[PDB]
Each structure stands twice: as C-alpha cells, then as structure tokens.
UniProtKB/TrEMBL annotation, chain B:
Similarity comment: family membership: Belongs to the V-ATPase D subunit family.
Domain of life the protein comes from: Eukaryota
Protein name: V-type proton ATPase subunit D
From TrEMBL, chain C:
Assembly behavior: V-ATPase is a heteromultimeric enzyme composed of a peripheral catalytic V1 complex attached to an integral membrane V0 proton pore complex.
One Gene Ontology biological process: vacuolar acidification
Alphabetical list of HAMAP family matching this protein: ATP_synth_B_arch
Protein name: Vacuolar proton pump subunit B
GO terms under cellular component: proton-transporting V-type ATPase, V1 domain
Residues of the ATPase F1/V1/A1 complex alpha/beta subunit N-terminal domain: 13-79
Amino acid sequence: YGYVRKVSGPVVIADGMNGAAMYELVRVGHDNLIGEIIRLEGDSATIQVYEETAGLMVNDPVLRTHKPLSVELGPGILGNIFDGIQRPLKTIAIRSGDVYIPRGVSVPALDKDTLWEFQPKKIGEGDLLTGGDLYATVFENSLMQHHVALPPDAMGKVTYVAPAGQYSLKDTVLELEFQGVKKSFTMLQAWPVRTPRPVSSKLAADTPLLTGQRVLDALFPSVLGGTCAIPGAFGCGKTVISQALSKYSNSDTVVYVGCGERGNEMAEVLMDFPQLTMTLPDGREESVMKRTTLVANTSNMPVAAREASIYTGITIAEYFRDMGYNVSMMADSTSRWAEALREISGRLAEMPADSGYPAYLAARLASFYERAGKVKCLGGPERTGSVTIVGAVSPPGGDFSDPVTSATLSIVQVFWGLDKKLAQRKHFPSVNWLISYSKYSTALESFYEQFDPDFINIRTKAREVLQREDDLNEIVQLVGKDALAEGDKITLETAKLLREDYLAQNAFTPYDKFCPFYKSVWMMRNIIHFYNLANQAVEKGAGMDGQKITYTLIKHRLGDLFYRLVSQKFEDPAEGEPALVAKFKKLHEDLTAGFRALEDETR
Amino acid sequence: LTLDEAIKTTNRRVNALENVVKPRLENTITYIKGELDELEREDFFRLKKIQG
Amino acid sequence: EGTLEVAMEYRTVTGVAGPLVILDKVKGPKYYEIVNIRLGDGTMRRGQVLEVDGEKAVVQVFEGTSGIDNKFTTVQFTGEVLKTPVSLDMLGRIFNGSGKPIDNGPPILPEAYLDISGSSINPSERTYPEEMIQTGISTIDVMNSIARGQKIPLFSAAGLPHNEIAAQICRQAGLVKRLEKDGEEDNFAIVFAAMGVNMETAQFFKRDFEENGSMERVTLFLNLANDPTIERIITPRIALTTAEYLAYECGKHVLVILTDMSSYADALREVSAAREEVPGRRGYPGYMYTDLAQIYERAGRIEGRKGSITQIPILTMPNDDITHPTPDLTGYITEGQIYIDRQLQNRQIYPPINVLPSLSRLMKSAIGEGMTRRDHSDVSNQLYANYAIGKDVQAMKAVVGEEALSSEDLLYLEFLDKFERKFVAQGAYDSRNIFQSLDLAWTLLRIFPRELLHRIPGKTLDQYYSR
Amino acid sequence: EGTLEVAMEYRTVTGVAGPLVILDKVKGPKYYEIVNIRLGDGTMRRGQVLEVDGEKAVVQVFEGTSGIDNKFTTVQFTGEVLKTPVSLDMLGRIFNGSGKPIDNGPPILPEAYLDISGSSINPSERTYPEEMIQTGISTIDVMNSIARGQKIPLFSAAGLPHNEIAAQICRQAGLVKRGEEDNFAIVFAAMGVNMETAQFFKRDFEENGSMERVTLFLNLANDPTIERIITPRIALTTAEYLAYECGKHVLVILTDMSSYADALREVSAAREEVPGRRGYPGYMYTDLAQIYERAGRIEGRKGSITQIPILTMPNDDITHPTPDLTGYITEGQIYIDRQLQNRQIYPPINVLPSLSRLMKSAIGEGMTRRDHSDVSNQLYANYAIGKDVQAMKAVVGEEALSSEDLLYLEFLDKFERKFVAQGAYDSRNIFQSLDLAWTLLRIFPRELLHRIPGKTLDQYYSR
C-alpha cells in the first residue's frame, strides 16, 4: 500500500502515506515490522520502527493498520513474560525452537485456544449494563480470580449471556444492544495504549505500601498507589530492592517491566519467583510468579521499543486496577527510556533543549507517572483499584543534577535516595536518610494514629537523632575525637546503633529478608526509648559525673542489654507475631529496669 | 597545648579543606565545560544545519 | 457590526509534527488567530496560530496532535485572538487549563469577552502600593512585608512545602492597618492558578479550598501535568485576565497565586524547540524574559479604580539554584524574593523561610505608622544585622573552635538558636497580628545589650527595649 | 531456490566529505548493505551504508576516504549485512581487526555464514550462571568470584599491569574440575593495542601451549579506527558460534574497552550525532549493551559464554562515562589499585570496590565452603573500617588508634601484606587461602564481629 523512502536507524520515512494519522500502527517491509507514526510531512510520514531496521530496502511495502498502538488486555496475561510490543516469549520459543528471537514473527498476544472456567455473575437477561460493569469473573489460576469486565464505551440490555463453562477467546459472552443493534462482546479487549484507561474519579490514598524493609517502611514510607523514585547509581543494584518489593509487597498483583534491564536479571526473576511462595490467609503454598507479569525487553533489544515497553506496562497495570485489585509496578532503568527518546529525537533533528534530551521529556515522564494513583473504578460493583508506580532513574555519573532525575524528583511524591557511600561500605539497603524524603507522611497520619500513636513521635526523634549525628560527625571531623560532650557522645551512641541495626537489612538472610511493621515499630521504640532514658540519666545522676560523664561506665555495665538491642534485628520473623512482640516487650522492660536501677545505683 | 591545637588545625586543613575544594573545582570545571560549551555548540550546529 | 462573515474552513494540513500543524493555501490568516480543529473522528480541538508567512500558517494545538491526518482533518479560522468570557459569576468555580469549567456546572454566561494579554496601562497612571496585608506568617509579616500590589515570588525547590505554605497564605490573607481590618469588595478574591501539578497536589488544593469556607471567594484554574503542555502557557494568562476584570472593572482587591513558574518555562521551551528557532541560555527561548515580564507586570494598584492585584508566584529552583534563567529573570522583574531553605527543612521547621536572602524592595513603603509600630523598620534592620553577624561568628567559631569563641560570639550563636527556634517556627494555622510579633522580636533584640544594638536608633530602643 | 544475482556496480559517487562517500541514482539500496569500494588506482576498501534516502545512499568507508575521485571510483553493493565466516577450524589462529587471517595460514573454510550483530537470546530462554571458574588467580576465586556465564570486567588505569594480568588469566584459565574437549575455548579480542603489546600477546599465547584452544583477534592502533568497532563484534559472533552452536565453553577477553569507546566517539563525531557526557555518543549505553549483553547460559544448549573485559579509567576516574556505563551494565567489577601497585604488589587488586554481583550463586554446596559468604563479607567490610582507622590516625596521630582502632589498622596492614599478594603463577586453591582469610578475620576479636554470626565460622575449624 505504501513504500519506504528513507531509512535512518530506528527512524524510517515512508512515501505515499497520504491518509495516515498520527500514532497509527503500521506494517513495514516484507517482514511487517511494527511502527508508529510520529511525524507526518506532506504525502510522506515518519515511522519509528520498534523492531530492528537493519537490512531494509527502499520500496519495501508499508501497510496501514488504521489502529493506534494497542495491547490485547484479555485474561491470561498474568504469569507470562511479554516483549516490549507485548509478544509472548514462551510461545515464540516453543513455536520456533531457535532460542534467538525471530524477526518478522506474528504470534498473537494471547492464545485464542485456551479454555477458561468462566463463571457468570448475577447478571440477567435484559439488565441495563454499562461500561466497566463486571458481568462475570473467571479463574485464570490459583489466586487469580480474574474479573471479566465490559469494555468502556459500551452499554445496552442483556440479550444473551453465556452459561458457565470452558470458553475460547473467540466465543461471544455478552450480546448487549444499546441503539437497537445487538453487539456481541468477547473476553478480548484492546486498548489504545497511549490513551489512559478511564476511571470514575481519582481519590486520595491512605493505605501504606508495606515493603517489608525497615528503612523504607518507617523512615520514608509510600502509600499504595503512590509514585516513587529510586535513582540507584551504578553499583547499587537497585533491582534487588525492586525484587524484594515485588516478593513481599501487600499488592494484589505485580507488573515488573525492565526497559534496558539486563537479561540475566529477568532470567533470575523468572527462575526464582515460582519457587518462592507467599502465605495468604488460607495459608496454602502459592507461587508469586502467577501474581507477577514481566513486560521487560533486554538491552540487546532495539531501543525504539523502550517507550512501547513502558506504555504497555502501565496500561496492563491500569487494566488490573480497573478490576478492583491493587497493583504495583516497577519500571527499571527509565534512564534507558530517556536515552531512547534522545536517540529517536536525534534522528528527527529536533533541537536538543538540554544535554541532548528533547524538550518534551518532562511532559512524557509526567504523563507516565501521573497515570499512577488510587481511583474509584467504573461500572458495578463499586471497585476501588489502585496502581503504584516505583520507577528508577539511573544517574549517568551518579550526579542527581541529571535532567531525568531532575524531572522525576520534580514530579515524584516520595523519593528514596541511594548513595555510593553506603553501597561501598556494604550497608546493603544503601538508603541515605538525608536526601530521601516522603511527601506522604501527612496522608498516613491517620493510619499511624490508629496503628500506634507513638510511631510518629519516635520517627521524628529518629530523624532528629540522625541529623544531629551528621552534624556532630562533621564537627568532630573538623575538630577531632577530643572534646566530645557526654550528651553529644550519648547522642552519637544509639545513632550508631540505629545505623547498624535498624537502618540496615541483610536482604539475603531469612531474618532480614522481610521485616514486619510491628517489629519495626518495636525496634525503633526500643532504640529511641534507650535514647530517652539516656537523656533522663544525663538530666539527673547525683552530680554531673554520674549523670552524663559516666555514660561510658553505663555502656560498660549495660553492655548485655545494649548487645540485646543490637541483636534484636537478628531474630527471624518465622517465630510469629506473639513471639516477637513478647520478646520486644521483655527486652524493652529489661532495658528500662536495668537502666533505672543502675541510674538508681550511686544516684 | 598550643602546638597540638595548631598541628591539629593544619592537618585538618590539609586533609579535608583542600582535599574537598579541589574536587569541587574539578567538578565545576567539568560540568561548566562539558555541558554548556558542548550543548551550545550542538545547538549552533543544529541551527546551521537547519539554515543549510 | 452591520454585517458579519462566517469562518473559513480549510481541509489542508501540509504537515504535522510535534504539537504543531502546518496549514497551507490559507488565505488571509490573522496572527494569533484562534482556530478550531475538527478531526476525522469528529472530535474538536482548539489551537492558536503561531506565525504566518504567505499562505502558510504554523498552528499550535492545545489538546495535542495525536489524531490529525491530511485526508480528513478540517480546521476553521475564527479570525480573532483568545477572548475568555468573564463575569462576577466566574467566582467560586474551578476551571481547566483552557478555562473550560470542570465544576460539573454550566459554562460561564459572559458579562464581556476580554482579549488575553489585556491592554497596557499608561505607566503615568499607575500608583505605588499604598497599604500592606497581614500574611499571618511571622517571617513574612515581620520582614519583607507584602503590600497591596506587591510582586513577591516564593523561591523554593523540590520537596519544600511551597504548596502547603501557599494554601496557608490563602487561608491567612488579611489586612493589617492599625489592626482595624463584611468587606465583600475588600474580600481578597484569590485567583489560584496552578500549572503542571501532581494530581495528589491538585486534590490537596481542591479539598483545602473546599474546607476553608472561602469557596464563595476563591477561584481555581488547573492545568495538571498529565494535561497537554500547550494548555499551560495560556492558563496563567487566563488567570491574569480574570483577575484584571474582577479587580479593575469589578472593584475588588484581588490576590493571585501562580504555581510552578518552572513548569511554564518548560512549556515555553517545548514550544520554542518544536518551532525550531535559536535558543538562549540553557536552550531556553530568548524571549522568555519578555514572557515573564508580561506575565508579572499585569499586577499593581491603579489610580482610576478602587481595585488592585497582588500576586505571589511560587517558583521552583530546578537544581536548587538561582543562576538558572527562570529565577534569574524573575528576580530581574519581580520586586521581591522569599527563600525556602533546604537547610531549614533538614532541621524540620515547617516554615523554612530564610530571611537572609529574602527581601522586598517596597518593604519601606509597605510599613507605616498606621500599618505597624514606628520601630518596625528598626526591628527588621537589627534582626538582619544580628543574623548576618551571627552567621559569620558561627563560621568563625567553627573554624577556630567553640571554646575560642568570645563572649559576644556565644551571644550571637545563642541569638541564632533562639531565632531559628521560636521566631521562624510557626504552626500550620498560626495567625498572629503584627504587633505581638514585633514585641517578641524586641524581646529577641533586648536579649542583646543596648550597646550592641548600634543599628537601632536610641529613640526606638527607649520606646521598646524594656517594655 | 530463487535464481542467483550478481552484485550491482555503481560509479555515481556525487560528493565526498569526511569519512562519508555520497552516492546517487542508486537502484534498490539496502540499509547496512556491505559495499566494497574500488578506487581508480585499483585498490579496494570496504564500508557501510549508514543512511538510505530516495536514490541516495551515504556510505562510511573503512580504510578512510583519502584518494577517492568523484569520477573514477566504483561502488559495488553486496546486498547483505556484514557476515563473518565462523567455523570450528577458527580455533588456534589469529586474525586482523576485520577478521582477515594474519597467522600465515589459509582463510577459514566456513561451516556456515553468520551475520554479526546477531539477534538477542530470547530473555525467557536465558538461564542464570551457576558454576565457578578457576581463572588461576587466588584473590578472584577467594572473593568476588566468577560464575560460568557471568560477565565481569577488570578496572585498571593506564600504566597498570592489567594486560599481564589478562595474559596470566588466559594461560592459567580452566574449569574448577571438582572434559578437555568441551573445556574453556578462550577467545581473545584485542581492541586497539600497541605493537609491542601485540607481540607480547602473540608470543605469550604461542609459547603457552594453549594455542591449541585459543583464537586471537588482534587489532593494532595503526588499523582504521572503524575496523576497531567491528572487532569486539566479530569476536563475540565467533564466541556465540563456538559456545551455543558448537558446545564448548568460551571465556571471552576484551582488552582496552576504553579504546573501543574512543573508536565509538571518533566515529560518532564524524557522523555528527548528538553527544552524551564528555562528548561520547548518546546511544553508547545501547552499543556497550550489544557488546556486553551476550555472555550467558542459554537453556537449550550446554554451552556457556563468560565475559571478562578490561577497562581503562581515562583520568583514573571511575566517574568517567565509559566506566559509568560499564558498571551500570556489566554485573560487578574487579578493581586494580594504583597505590597498591606503588606498594610493589604484583596483583594490585583493591578489594574495597571489587565486588561480584553473582557471587551469591557462585558460592554453594557444590563448591566453596558454608562460611565463604560470611568470610567474604567480613574481609570486605572490616577493610573499609581499617582504612577509616588509618585516616583517623593520619589526621590525629599514632595514639589516636585505640584498642579497637589499632586492631583494624593491623588487620588492614596484614591483609594488604599476606592475603592479597600472590605469585606470578600462583594457583592458590580456595581452602588454603580461606584458612589465612579466617586468620585475618580472627586478628580482630572473635566476638567483636558484628555482621557475621560466630556459628557460621564455627562450622569451619582452625587447623
């Protein structure tokens, strides 16, 4: 229909493209490569080809699909690895034994032949259904409970509803008729990826995201449906944090997408999630892999498809959101997406506004982040889904003045600042307490109050202790280890304990793999209450000697209790909530009693 | 006591003040040049190509 | 007005790229002609004519360029510049970036249409700010006061609660003259325009103005980040035009809150890059100074009318700096600057205002015998000098040693401590009159000896040293 | 089969500038079609068509554009992307940067032509690295280990013995063996080396007796700069063929990774493209990925590719764009210290930044000991604290090191003296080294140890 005129890396110019509209999928060459209109000039148009463009020839056929970028968002996507264009990897490998990714394959997004146990809902014949109405639900697998919903922009009366039973995706289920015409629906639903899936109304989020890591859960929390940023300069390996969040989040579903991510990392994900199990209230062993979908394309894949990868990820997350579930997404190495934008715009000769990155960078990144949130879903019943976005912005050179980092930190709500210093010292979380900041503290105040009112006070005290520790470290480095005030020495103490015990998690040991929130609260309370007791002892000790000067002697005589404080992190959570709470109770009371008696002694 | 204080001040200066300021100067020079000069010349070249 | 003409309708779209469409064979195209774009699917988008040459015309599109095709896209030329509808009914309503209402209500029934970027006021007819308003914030009220018609931008960075303090200022807007001040005309009629704000911040602002009870007074224009960029370059202009009508032709004091000027500069850069012209500093368009001047200079008292406009545009330092073109040009234009300091935020002070860089050019005229006590200027000067000397003394004590610090050195450090502890710190809803704040400032000043208060004249000291 | 066709021969070169030759009136071009330009003098050289537009075609030659006439040079279109005749016989020989034989032997008889810049392994197909490698160096196997499929580079500034280290690793390379036909078949890329270093490599490999299983890809600096970029591609293509489609494990070595980056910057600047940091091309992350992101263990096949590049910090700064991108991509690093080299240590590895991201899977029950991870963690963490102790001693004095700091300083000194040092041919096995590693760990008090549990090392026994 159309023919190619110019080929320049990922960008391809086609002539005879008169009727083409922007962002319409297009088939290029005898191999029918995927492409999206980006710039149209005259009878010609510009196409970014998501596939590799090497080997094209002038006058290769160009075919219009007339449909914008679309993803088949039907059931069965859970637990499957999909490419940037959302092609099924496993089916491709099975169909063509060649492990190498073929070029020109047309595998459908989802198998048209799977039989799914379909359970129709309370819907009846002639009922007035609307867009987003859950006319039924289907079990993809254990803990899926996939809810088939009517696509938006659809309404009518139920002329025919299918009975319960196994169904192919070709099979029609609903046959609603709005304006007399009887339209038949099926499980397959295609969505223009660029246009967000509509919602009834966005709303504030007040359910905290439980990462299971002490530092992030307490110091810099995030709410479900929030927006987060992990810079993670080279050497930090942020992907371990992302994987830990995926494994031990409270989310209903995980959509992991890696743009520019290493292939080894996706291999690790797919080879370690199925064995790892999460315990639901029913308690049965269940594989996280079913809860997780992977939209990643490795760094070897063409860079034109980074944008398609991220948008397919976000639209799949939105689709799960409209189902009423709470889904969290990690977008590894969005800096690769920024480089993809720069490479694409470079060929278009668009003037580089800043450091090669095109001017319209903040706009696209802001759109991608703003798709996040917690919303009231459309249709019946009254679902309230949510999407949590936790992206990654790797700073080239480890400087946060980078344009991608600048825009992200400008538009992000909560920011977790990784640093090279803690990474070098093998701290492991490497979450710098200074630069990191959470704008969700005000929202989670109600949750904190209902859980434990003490949490906010001890949190503020811990922040003050850390800031004082930094200031005292600077002052000492300026002056020296001499002339250290006994109160200042006691402040630096238990701040070292905070850093060594509470702020660090092994992340590869059974005890530190997952930190429950209650034990985190207990541990912070123990540390800060030891600090408060030390301050009280400094206040009164039968003379300034026993009060504060003998803090060293206190450390000598309270050494067992201080060692218990530092070892409280070592205990595993498998002991159960009662065991942990009893141990923390006895530890806190023993510490208080020993401190008071020793403070009573000689004072 | 005075000699100890003075030696401490001098050692602190030589170990921290200059050893931090010199990296600051290097970073400032690197950022200034490799960002402003490079991007300004790139913009000028792109404009020249546009006119061409 | 005898006879009219119906708008032309061309189907020619010789070129579509970025946020722009290039129409051709368009005869008699005006500059800044407002065009309505009927797509093939039938959806309607509105845009502006960026430049005209021969039969060509570069048309920017407000709602984006994601559906245009040569065969079926049709565009109409209305033959006029943007004229937003305005009326007194525009109050108490929330509007999209382009001015389309989103309050689930009806569109504005216009009292008149006003061309955007309204007529330039004869400078010989302007007047200096006469009275000042009480901001409630101690740092703002005591130093760098805000006068009716003053242009005070709040300088902040990412993370700093500039939005929260903006909401607090909207809550605490009030007059101060001799503590005397229904006042429906005197009602501040806050016109809050935010561009490219996070949806969470949008809901925050909506709920904050809904709960404050000023919903019959305030008026919000929103252009969210996910909203198209081009819409953002008009939203503050719409806000300024609405404020100009509600103030000048409606006789009401009007306060304007513009949010995230860095976002506006981003939209300007995007438009310039899409048009592909010579860039300026940091690749920005060279006329960004003119745009900021035209967006700022539309405020101030006017001799012939009882109204006024006092605008507080919060600005985001991109890399927490000032040499960036946006803060630099804003300082060149705006007659003030209030700084929010990351160091203050690190010590967890809810208002992080650092008074040392903060300054109002018209503070001297703002303070008056009716407005404040006669010693108010002395308080400001003494606090400035004491804070500066205390910072220098703190640096000297750090380099030489805490013990080596003299008696006056410890006095200055103690003054810094009590200042940053009691003076700057204020509650989320602390709203105190200027007089008690000045009295507590005299307490802080009398902590220093009379001799050290050399900057203060002796008469003001005798008036308010012992008290 | 569809009938053959002979290549077109053009003469319509209509403009030359820089490294680019512009053609016109081309009938049916092809992107990245390899062209073999023949000049008027009769000499020939190759090049790639980097852009195709209309009937025009922009060609970037290989051997440079000098001596090309707009009315006598003839261009021929092979109509295919670059292909390297990979075959099993390629073992035990040497090749130029472009792959032409230089071992005074006949050209390779190909088993099958394979287009270089090969398609990515399906991500689902890729499998995690699980088996340790006996490089023949102690400090690498003891801590910051290597897995048979794991990529890890060697960081080393100019003037350091990193080339000698690479030669030692290549000659002492071997499987853990805890066979020979499928053993390590080392491919040794050489991206832009000095002639003296080239002779060094040739002599060392020939005399080592490992020439029965090692293929070199030498590329000197005198060679055309573009020919340098296709070298670490041809090398990886041959490695892929030998490992996945021929079975034997391959331990690929790339030298002067910075030289490849310099080759990229020069070519990109000639192409007048958008510059990243330091003027390097913006898409360098992609093109370093296409090089690095090839080593790994495909599931359907028993082969394995292991990647050991060698970088060179230009200004001795790890913040340079090339090491930054590498550390982003390459899954760990081995670091070489200039100060330790000044201290007259032959393997000057600095253990503070030397980490292996896949070491957690390299250790296990099949190999190493149950305390290997804990010993590595302690000897990796206490070294930093000892360095901080040394800094505090320097900024205060000798008496500043208290009863705890002095132990850290002594641990650092003994660690830099005994453990790190090794012979020029030392195959120090893991257990004998880990004994003295635990001795170093026990220099510090056996109970003051914070991170490690005492029971883990208690599983091991002294003597």
